[PDB]
Amino acid sequence: KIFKPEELRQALMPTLEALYRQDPESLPFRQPVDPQLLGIPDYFDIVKNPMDLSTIKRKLDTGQYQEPWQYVDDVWLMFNNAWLYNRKTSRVYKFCSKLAEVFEQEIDPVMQSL
Ligand SMILES: CC(=O)N1CCc2c(c(N3CCCc4cc(-c5cnn(C)c5)ccc43)nn2[C@H]2CCOC2)C1
């Protein structure tokens, strides 16, 4: 079907806010990865399509999602990037796993409502 921009925003923005509310777990994901600042210059060799919470928020606010699954795909791109780049023992990897648990919990009832 057809989704209006504000219908998508009202439904999906709370699920994004649920990720931001995870502290410390959302902190590595709030801004685009800056490999030079972080000392990890191999990042863009490994992660070809970067994604983060700030970019998803902007796309939601600017109507760049036409369907809910496009938003879900970006959130999952952010997760899969972090599980790919970071080691299983690292903070970022474990924080990613926590965010994915929280997102799964919140997005399910929202998809039902849409
Ligand atoms: C998402 C992702 O793939 N990244 C690539 C790797 C990475 C990223 C962060 N960042 C991003 C800036 C904010 C941040 C905050 C924390 C934090 C805050 N509070 N606590 C308890 C932890 C941890 C990591 C990060 N560091 N590194 C590595 C460099 C050395 O450390 C690990 C992002």
Alpha-carbon gap, residue 94 to 28, rounded angstroms: 11
Handedness of CA 86, 43, 81, 22 (dihedral sign): positive
Domain count, the chain: 1
3-class SS of residue 75: helix
Q: Is the omega angle on the peptide bond into residue 24 within 30 degrees of 0, that is, cis? A: yes
> From the CB of 33, is ligand 1 less than 6 Å away?
yes
Buried b (16+ CB within 10 A) or exposed e, 41-70: eebeeebeeebbbebbbeebeeeebeebee
> From the CB of 72, is ligand 1 less than 6 Å away?
no
- Would you say 7 and 65 are in contact if contact means Cβ atoms under 8 Å apart? no
Choice from 30, 36, 38, 55 to test ligand 1 binding pocket (greatest atom count within 8 A of CB): 38
Count how many residues are written for the chain. 114
CATH of the domain at 56: 1.20.920.10
> From the CB of 77, is ligand 1 less than 6 Å away?
no
Alpha-carbon gap, residue 13 to 106, rounded angstroms: 11
Q: Which residue's CA is the closest to the ligand 1 atom numbered 2? A: 82
Which element (helix H / strand E) includes 64? Answer: none
Method: X-ray
Question: Resolution of this entry in Å?
Answer: 1.6
> From the CB of 41, is ligand 1 less than 6 Å away?
no
Q: Which range marks the domain in which residue 83 is found?
A: 1-114
Cα-to-centroid distance, 6 and ligand 1 (Å): 32
